C-alpha cells in the first residue's frame, strides 16, 4: 500500500463512515460512499489515483447527522441500493444512481449508530440505536421483523453489531461495556422472517407484528472496561474493541466449547489474542475487514493506519504493518477495502479522504 490521493469535503464536519460497494457489476469502476455532516457522497476510483466525485444526497434537515451507511441490492432488479442513518433515527434507502431517497423507516426515533445487511439476504437490514435496541427490518415488504432489547438487552447506546458468516446470529456491543449474542436461526425468528415476506398491507387488515426479543443468547462485560465501539465475527471467533488501544480476539465459553452449544448463562470467555496500537482513546473509531477476511484495518486519532494480515494459523500470530503520510494528521473514523482488496480508503474528522492503493 502507498498513498495515491486525498481530498477534503466542503462541509469540514467529521466523515463518520466509508463503504465501498461490494455489489458493483463486473467491469464498472470501484465506487465508495462517505457519510458525514447531513450528506452521503459517492466517489468513483480511477487510474493514477483519481477520485472522481459523483453526486450527494443531502438531508432536508440541516440538523441531520449521518453516521453510517451500508450497501445492498434490489432483490428483483439487482440494482445497488445504499442505506443511510444517523442522529435523527431515520433509515433512508437511497438510489445511488440518481441519489433519490426511495423510502425510509422510522421507528428507532433515536440516533442510529450502525447499519448492517444480512450476508445472504439482501433485504434484511439490522439497525443499532442510541435507544439501546437493535431492530431487524425487511426492506422488501417494509416490515419491522424484530426488536432486540429489554432489560437483559443493552442498558445504554448500541454502537456496533455484526452478523456471522451465514446470518444465523448477531453480535452487538455498546456503551454498557458489553457484547451480546442474539440468535436469529431460532424457530421463532426463522418463522418471523418468513412471515415478513408473506406480509402485504394491501391484501390484509392486520399490522405486521414485530418480535420482541428481550434475552440475549449470551452476554459479557469481561473483554473491555469501556464503551465497546466496534465488533466483527471472525468465523466462530470475535474481534472487538473499545477505546483502550486494543482489538481483542475472543470467543464465548471455554476453549473447546462450540459456539452453537452456548447457553445464555455462560459466564466464561476465552481470549485468543490482542492487537495493540497507539493513540486511539476516543470513542467511535471503527475497524473494517476486506471481503475474504484476510486483513483488518483501523486508523487512529492522529492519522496513522494499522493493517493486520490475519492469514496465519492462529489469531495471535497476526502481522501488523503501518501506513502514515506526513499530511494525514486528523482522526480516522473508519476504513473500507474494495472488494478485490486493491484499494483502502480512510476518512477523517477533518472531512478529508485518503486513498491507499496496493
From Swiss-Prot:
Reported effect, residue 155 to T: In COGIS; decreased trimethylation of 'Lys-27' of histone H3; no effect on interaction with EZH2
Tissue specificity as recorded in UniProt: Expressed in brain, colon, heart, kidney, liver, lung, muscle, ovary, peripheral blood leukocytes, pancreas, placenta, prostate, spleen, small intestine, testis, thymus and uterus. Appears to be overexpressed in breast and colon cancer.
Region (Interaction with EZH2): 1-358
Keyword Transcription: yes
UniProt region (Required for interaction with the matrix protein MA of HIV-1), positions on chain: 68-222, 220-358
Modified positions (N6,N6,N6-trimethyllysine) in chain numbering: 116, 187, 203
Cellular component GO terms, alphabetical: chromatin silencing complex; cytosol; ESC/E(Z) complex; nucleoplasm; nucleus; pronucleus; sex chromatin
Protein's cellular compartments: Nucleus; Chromosome
Modified residues (N6-methyllysine): 116, 187, 203
Primary location: nucleus
Record PTM: Methylated. Binding to histone H1 'Lys-26' promotes mono-, di-, and trimethylation of internal lysines.
This protein's record includes keyword Iron: no
Listed transmembrane segments: none
First and last residues of every WD repeat: 10-53, 61-104, 107-147, 153-194, 223-260, 278-318, 327-358
N6,N6-dimethyllysine: modified positions: 116, 187, 203
Clinical disorder: Cohen-Gibson syndrome: An autosomal dominant overgrowth disorder characterized by accelerated osseous maturation, advanced bone age, skeletal abnormalities including flaring of the metaphyses of the long bones, large hands with long fingers and camptodactyly, scoliosis, cervical spine anomalies, dysmorphic facial features, and variable intellectual disability.
Subunit structure: Component of the PRC2/EED-EZH2 complex, which includes EED, EZH2, SUZ12, RBBP4 and RBBP7 and possibly AEBP2. The minimum components required for methyltransferase activity of the PRC2/EED-EZH2 complex are EED, EZH2 and SUZ12. Component of the PRC2/EED-EZH1 complex, which includes EED, EZH1, SUZ12, RBBP4 and AEBP2. The PRC2 complex may also interact with DNMT1, DNMT3A, DNMT3B and PHF1 via the EZH2 subunit and with SIRT1 via the SUZ12 subunit. Interacts with HDAC, HDAC2, histone H1 and YY1. May interact with ITGA4, ITGAE and ITGB7. Interacts with CDYL. Interacts with BMAL1.
Family affiliation: Belongs to the WD repeat ESC family.
Name this polypeptide is given: Polycomb protein EED
Species whose genome carries this gene: Homo sapiens (Human)
Positions spanned in the full protein: 82 to 439 of 441
Amino acid at each position: 500500500f502507498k498513498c495515491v490521493n486525498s481530498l477534503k469535503e466542503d462541509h469540514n464536519q467529521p466523515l463518520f463512515g466509508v463503504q465501498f460497494n461490494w455489489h458493483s457489476k463486473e467491469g464498472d469502476p470501484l465506487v465508495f460512499a462517505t457519510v458525514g455532516s447531513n450528506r452521503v457522497t459517492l466517489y468513483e476510483c480511477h487510474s493514477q489515483g483519481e477520485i472522481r466525485l459523483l453526486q450527494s444526497y443531502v438531508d432536508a434537515d440541516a440538523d441531520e447527522n449521518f453516521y453510517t451507511c451500508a450497501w445492498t441490492y434490489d432483490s428483483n432488479t439487482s440494482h445497488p441500493l445504499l442505506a443511510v442513518a444517523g442522529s435523527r433515527g431515520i433509515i433512508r434507502i437511497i438510489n445511488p444512481i440518481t441519489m433519490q431517497c426511495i423510502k425510509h423507516y422510522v421507528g428507532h426515533g433515536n440516533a442510529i449508530n450502525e447499519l448492517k445487511f444480512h450476508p445472504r439476504d439482501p433485504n434484511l437490514l439490522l439497525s443499532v440505536s442510541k435507544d439501546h435496541a437493535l431492530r431487524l427490518w425487511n426492506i422488501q415488504t417494509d416490515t419491522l421483523v424484530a426488536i432486540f432489547g429489554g432489560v437483559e438487552g443493552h442498558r445504554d447506546e448500541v454502537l456496533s453489531a455484526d452478523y456471522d458468516l451465514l446470518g444465523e446470529k448477531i453480535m452487538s456491543c455498546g456503551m454498557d461495556h458489553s457484547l451480546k449474542l442474539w440468535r436469529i436461526n431460532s424457530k421463532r425468528m426463522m418463522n418471523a422472517i418468513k412471515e415478513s415476506y408473506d406480509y402485504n398491507p394491501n391484501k390484509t387488515n392486520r399490522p405486521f407484528i414485530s418480535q420482541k426479543i428481550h434475552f440475549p443468547d449470551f452476554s459479557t462485560r469481561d473483554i473491555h472496561r469501556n464503551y465497546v465501539d466496534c465488533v466483527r465475527w471472525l468465523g466462530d471467533l470475535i474481534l472487538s474493541k473499545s477505546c483502550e488501544n486494543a482489538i481483542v480476539c475472543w470467543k464465548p465459553g471455554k476453549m473447546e466449547d462450540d459456539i452453537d452449544k452456548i447457553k445464555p448463562s455462560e459466564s466464561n470467555v476465552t481470549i485468543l489474542g490482542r492487537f495493540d496500537y497507539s493513540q486511539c482513546d476516543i470513542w467511535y473509531m471503527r475497524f473494517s475487514m476486506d471481503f475474504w477476511q484476510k486483513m483488518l484495518a483501523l486508523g487512529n486519532q492522529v492519522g496513522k493506519l494499522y493493517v493486520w494480515d490475519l492469514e496465519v494459523e492462529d489469531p495471535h500470530k497476526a502481522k501488523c504493518t503501518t501506513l502514515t503520510h506526513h499530511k494525514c494528521g486528523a482522526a480516522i473514523r473508519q476504513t473500507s477495502f474494495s472488494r478485490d482488496s486493491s484499494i483502502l480508503i480512510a476518512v477523517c474528522d477533518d472531512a478529508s479522504i485518503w486513498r491507499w492503493d496496493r
